[PDB]
């Protein structure tokens, strides 16, 4: 109780260690990352995605759920997986990625993937403190999980209020909604959808251990229904036995500069 998502979260928290690890990957999609990771380790800067995040964003983009263009701001860029992916997209002109980095968090990694010269990544930034800037696309992949969904709600609401500050009339967007099932977050998402449209969409590359959904600009659908469908899916997935992930090839981000 009281929402279905809360029931799922409690059941998730009650799992044994081995049971949790099995559950986390049951019937999900995964990216085949081995060779890309090995190449990056060796100092290779062409082709490779810096994280499995490039493929995660590619899933939204290839389905036109978000269509990055013009000036792209990537809030919480980490190593730069979303930023470098956008750097190669036809209608993108500029990508600014901003992230905490420092001890305990991923630092931006310099790469030479296609359109890298369009991408500027900055570490040591708290995005909640910086003045919003005009942008054509607003991306945000921030949200720290908690065993306590009330804590996640407080965090999620801060992200939602943040991104609201960066959106204009016709902004393309893709925003992680860490916990979309808590009543307070439902209420906020309904208001935001009234104002900016879009809808919440579940990415098949998300793990079963999170109820994250992404608010994407080029989608429609009732907030409550979209969230409850995912609550039911995640509950259904507890019942799977002897199941694991299905892999897909990673993204090839090419090489070279763009003018
Ligand atoms: C010290 O408390 C830990 C952290 O709050 C969190 C792990 O931190 P991390 O920064 O890796 O979190 P994420 O990157 O978002 O991904 P996870 O997929 O590991 O965590 C997402 C949620 O998944 C749950 N969880 C996460 N882990 C690692 C477990 C687990 O081992 N057993 C278990 N029953 N549940 C979990 C918990 O509700 C988490 O909020 O997971 C917690 N954790 C660790 N061991 C346990 C545990 O034995 N039970 C439990 N309910 N939570 C646990
Ligand atoms: N307040 C904040 N300011 C800047 N970055 C933040 C932040 N809160 C969390 N973050 C960062 O946001 C990052 C998410 S990185 C997520 C993956 C990224 N989209 C990729 O494709 O590689 C984490 O590194 C985290 O530390």
176 and 161 in contact (C-beta within 8 Å)?
no
- Discontinuities after residues in the chain (C–N over 2.5 A): none
127 is in an annotated binding site: yes
The DSSP-derived string for 24-89 is HHTT-EEEE-HHHHHHHHTT--SS--SSTHHHHHHHHHHTTSS---EEEEEET-TTSHHHHHHHTS
Considering the segment(s) 1-259 as one domain, its CATH architecture is 3-Layer(aba) Sandwich (3.40)
Q: What share of the chain is helix, strand, coil (3-state, %, to 5)?
A: 35, 15, 45
Report CA torsion sign: 80, 81, 82, 87.
positive
How many CB atoms lie under 10 A from the CB of residue 53?
A: 23
54 and 81 in contact (C-beta within 8 Å)?
yes
Chain centroid offset of residue 19 CA: 25
For the stretch 224-228, contacts whose Cβ atoms lie closer than 8 Å and that sit 24 or more positions apart, written own/partner, are: 224/186, 226/199, 226/200, 226/201, 227/5, 227/180, 227/181, 227/186, 227/200, 228/4, 228/5, 228/181
49 and 40 in contact (C-beta within 8 Å)?
no
**60 phi/psi in degrees, rounded to 5:** -65, -45
248 and 30 in contact (C-beta within 8 Å)?
yes
40 and 109 in contact (C-beta within 8 Å)?
yes
Quote the CA–CA distance of 40 and 211 in Å, as a whole number. 30
Ligand 2: residue whose CA is nearest its atom 10: 76
Ligand 1: residue whose CA is nearest its atom 31: 17
Quote the CA–CA distance of 170 and 179 in Å, as a whole number. 25
99 is in an annotated binding site: yes
In the structure, how many helices (H) and strands (E) does the chain have?
Answer: 8, 9
139 and 72 in contact (C-beta within 8 Å)?
yes
All residues at 6 or more sequence positions from 185 whose CB lies less than 8 Å from its CB, including other chains? 153, 156, 157, 160, 177, 179
Quote the CA–CA distance of 158 and 161 in Å, as a whole number. 5
d(CA 147, ligand 1 centre) in Å: 7
Report the residue among 101, 103, 105, 251 best suited for mutation to probe ligand 2: largest number of ligand atoms under 8 A from its CB.
105
Report the residue among 37, 49, 76 best suited for mutation to probe ligand 2: largest number of ligand atoms under 8 A from its CB.
76
């Amino acid at each position: 109780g009281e929402t279905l998502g809360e029931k799922w979260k409690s059941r998730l928290n009650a799992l044994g260690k081995s049971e949790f690890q099995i559950y986390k990957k049951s019937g999900i999609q995964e990216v085949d990352r081995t060779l890309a990771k090995e190449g990056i380790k060796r100092g290779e800067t062409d082709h490779h995605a810096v994280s499995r995040g490039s493929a995660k964003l590619r899933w939204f983009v290839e389905r036109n759920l978000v269509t990055p263009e013009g000036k792209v701001v990537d809030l919480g860029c980490g190593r730069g997986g979303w930023s470098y992916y956008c750097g190669g997209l036809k209608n993108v002109r500029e990508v600014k990625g901003l992230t905490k980095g420092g001890p305990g968090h991923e630092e931006p990694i310099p790469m030479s993937t296609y359109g890298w010269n369009l991408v500027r990544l900055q570490s040591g930034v708290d995005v909640f403190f910086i003045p919003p800037e005009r942008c054509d696309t607003l991306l945000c992949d921030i949200g720290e999980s908690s065993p306590n969904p009330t804590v996640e709600a407080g965090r999620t609401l801060r992200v939602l209020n943040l991104v609201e500050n960066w959106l204009s009339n016709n902004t393309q967007f893709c925003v992680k909604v860490l916990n979309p099932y808590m009543s307070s977050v439902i209420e906020k998402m309904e208001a935001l959808q009234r104002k900016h449209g879009g809808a919440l969409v579940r990415n098949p590359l998300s793990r079963n251990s999170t109820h994250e959904m992404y608010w994407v600009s080029n989608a429609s659908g009732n907030i409550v229904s979209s969230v409850n469908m995912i609550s039911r899916m995640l509950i259904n997935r507890f019942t799977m036995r002897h199941k694991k992930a299905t892999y897909e090839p990673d993204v090839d981000l090419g090489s070279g500069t763009r003018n």
